[PDB]
Amino acid sequence: TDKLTSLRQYTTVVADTGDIAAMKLYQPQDATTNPSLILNAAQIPEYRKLIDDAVAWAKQQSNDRAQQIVDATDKLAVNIGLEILKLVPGRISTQVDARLSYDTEASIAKAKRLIKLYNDAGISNDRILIKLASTWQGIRAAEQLEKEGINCNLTLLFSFAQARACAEAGVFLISPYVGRILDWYKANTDKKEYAPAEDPGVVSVSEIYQYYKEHGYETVVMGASFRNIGEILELAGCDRLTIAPTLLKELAESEGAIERKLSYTGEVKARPARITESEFLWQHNQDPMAVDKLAEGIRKFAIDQEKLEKMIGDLL
Amino acid sequence: TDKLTSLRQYTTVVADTGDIAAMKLYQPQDATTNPSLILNAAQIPEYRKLIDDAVAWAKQQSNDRAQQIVDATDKLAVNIGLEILKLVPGRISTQVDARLSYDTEASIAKAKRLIKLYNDAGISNDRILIKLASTWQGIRAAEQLEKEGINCNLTLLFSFAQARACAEAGVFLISPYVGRILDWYKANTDKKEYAPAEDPGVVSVSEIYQYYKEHGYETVVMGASFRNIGEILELAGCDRLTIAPTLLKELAESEGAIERKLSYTGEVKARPARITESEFLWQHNQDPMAVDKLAEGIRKFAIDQEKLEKMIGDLL
Ligand SMILES: [Cl-]
Ligand SMILES: [Cl-]
Ligand SMILES: [Cl-]
Ligand SMILES: [Cl-]
């Protein structure tokens, strides 16, 4: 047996890519995309049809250029989601424009708009996760969306404060990063070598997992962003893990059974009072890694969004 | 003539220390303190009377230990402020517990408490600045305090978003940092040498000064936190500058007249709509330096507060 097969006994495998080739190859349950993966998957010549469809559709919905750019970029992300749903039985994650990350109202609106486009294609809400950055504003947006039947993937989750706040908001799923946590520690300490169990991204997810299970929270824990297979194996037992094709390949090519690493066998414990905004802000900003990486991840995703819109604008 | 004397033609000189010796020596207009300067000034044997007075007074106001700790640490800061006001004609800046930095209500309450203690000593509000970190919550706290006749010093000002928000809130004074901005650039780029005019902290304050004057804002601009006299000289013309004794000494010992560097000679311009919380959050987090340093400065001031309270708790 190979390690990818063995992992699937303990963990729901999810493919982190916009490339349908990977869906066929690894047959994941869910898939995740983001603005940069959409931007990358756009250059694939076989996807040119999806870009043209998106641009054409946008011109049929309105006559204003600015609106056509937005409509086309949204429809493109959706169009790619639709191709992926042909090949996976579970969820597709589609990311909202990260420029809205500190705007609750705008994020709710944008989530609803992407859902409308999916619904217009005949896809139900139970096949979709809307990905938002887990700022306070994003978490509050997600809380509201869930009440309206729109399930959310709360991403760029770095601090325990973010983890706690997401759970208390009843979000469908969280995407705690692993690899970008490792990146920080390598950039800000002189320890650049870590055993898998002491990888700080692995430690973060394990602690979050424990807290979620021990309090009986339903939010799906999905580790994301990996630098190596060691990190992935150390989180075997995590509800889901979203993994890039390069690392799915490495697992598939690695022989041997693996053991479950993440479990909670105790009973559910009473929950505390909800963390307030002020408490969340204090506790998030206690974590210098999380401070840096949440803001940084948002900046980079917004740049990817802008580049996507540039590409679409040239075709109109 | 010396450079300290020459600077005073263009800029109001302020002493950044809790040490009364410096007030006598340099005869500044205002003084600034903070938890660490209070903690430092506590070890000075000649201040032991101020610590004992604070502890004694606290035991007379109440019988609860926890409240005595808070009362004593507040009274100590106030007691030091009072000794300084004997030797300066202008303002004393006293910093609120930085653990409150993301809590508007608590910060307002704390500001009012420190003002009460000063008022109880016979000091008017026009001699005092309450120093709060310029988070959104701190700015909103300051807006309200100003309306109630309590003047504020908005500190740890790093991003343009913080500057704009403070001006629009009508705060009495801002303390844009200079040296800590330089710190970040040195640590996060491979340029560790900067000409005074290209020092990123100097550039920051100069841009803020321009924006404030050009829009006729009354908020006092007071550069703070300096690594060298080059930075200070490059901001000659800034409304005020708060300077550590070490650097005041260097200026006093430096011979020669200096030129004014910071001026605005144009007419006042129309102001934009107020920045919203969401816009502020977006724009502040676009500035990786400011993201890091605002949170870091708050963490360190809170640690200094805790150490001060430890020291006070041992004496009760
Ligand atoms: Cl968002
Ligand atoms: Cl929208
Ligand atoms: Cl950001
Ligand atoms: Cl952030």
Curated annotation (Swiss-Prot), chains A, B:
CDD domains given in the database record: Transaldolase_TalAB (cd00957)
Reactions mediated catalytically: D-sedoheptulose 7-phosphate + D-glyceraldehyde 3-phosphate = D-erythrose 4-phosphate + beta-D-fructose 6-phosphate
Active-site residues from the entry: 131 (schiff-base intermediate with substrate)
GO cellular component, one term: membrane
Similarity annotation: Belongs to the transaldolase family. Type 1 subfamily.
This protein's name: Transaldolase B
Phylogenetic classification of the source organism: Bacteria, Pseudomonadati, Pseudomonadota, Gammaproteobacteria, Enterobacterales
Summary of the function given for this chain in its UniProt record: Transaldolase is important for the balance of metabolites in the pentose-phosphate pathway.
Keywords assigned: Cytoplasm, Pentose shunt, Schiff base, Transferase
